[PDB]
């Protein structure tokens, strides 16, 4: 039988991903431009884009963690269904 083995490891989440990923691209570019493509670095500008950058990166991490959570909830149900294979 299966003994101690277990299963091997949505528009809303997709929407969250596309907007956050576009924001990562936007903010990476603006931090790069304001730190490397200017004659004089404006620190207020760099702080603003760093805040927008971290918020976009952390939004993508939040979606990925939610997808891992959903995947394990699904694996839980598949594991429960597989208990019936024990005959």
């Amino acid at each position: 039988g299966r003994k101690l083995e277990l299963t091997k490891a949505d528009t809303q989440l997709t929407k969250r991903v596309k907007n956050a990923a576009a924001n990562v691209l936007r903010e990476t570019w603006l931090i790069y431009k304001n730190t490397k493509l200017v004659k004089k670095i404006d620190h207020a500008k760099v702080r603003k884009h760093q805040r927008k950058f971290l918020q976009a990166i952390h939004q993508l991490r939040s979606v990925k963690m939610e997808q891992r959570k959903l995947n394990d909830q699904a694996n839980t149900l598949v594991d429960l269904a597989k208990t019936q294979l024990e005959h």
Partner: protein, 146 residues
């Protein structure tokens, strides 16, 4: 992607573990009850997401063919050795790879569903390979998962 005759019949029995009120469909409400019976706490959106990932006709419920179809995609199983070793490590107070027979009784007779003192004796008899009153849990888990 492939299921046998015997497996289809057994997954019919499995469908009954989910279809609580017995009407041939799984709703978010029935899914929530089953998930909570397993000590999990999915939110409303997570239950709807689970229904939506497998519901092909978009009626908001899971029928038996949609249920069977998703089981085919995840038939592959994997060994649980590392995860079980990590559960034993929770009780390894000094992180030395050992749990004493005394600490094992203290844990098993007080935490979770519990074992009786007699059941603990049978477990320790098997686990304490060297008869030194100490359990090398990496070795014990490897024995059980072999």
């Amino acid at each position: 992607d492939q299921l046998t005759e015997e497996q289809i019949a057994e997954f019919k029995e499995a469908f009954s573990l989910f279809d609580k009120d017995g009407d041939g469909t799984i709703t978010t409400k029935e899914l929530g009850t089953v998930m909570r019976s397993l000590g999990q706490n999915p939110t409303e959106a997570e239950l709807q997401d689970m229904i939506n990932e497998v519901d092909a006709d978009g009626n908001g419920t899971i029928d038996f063919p949609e249920f069977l179809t998703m089981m085919a995609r995840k038939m592959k199983d994997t060994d649980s050795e590392e995860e079980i070793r990590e559960a034993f490590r929770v009780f390894d107070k000094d992180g030395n790879g050992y749990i004493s027979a005394a600490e094992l009784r203290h844990v098993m007779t007080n935490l979770g569903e519990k074992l009786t003192d007699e059941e603990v004796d049978e477990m320790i008899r098997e686990a304490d390979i060297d008869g030194d009153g100490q359990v090398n849990y990496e070795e014990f888990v490897q024995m059980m998962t072999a």
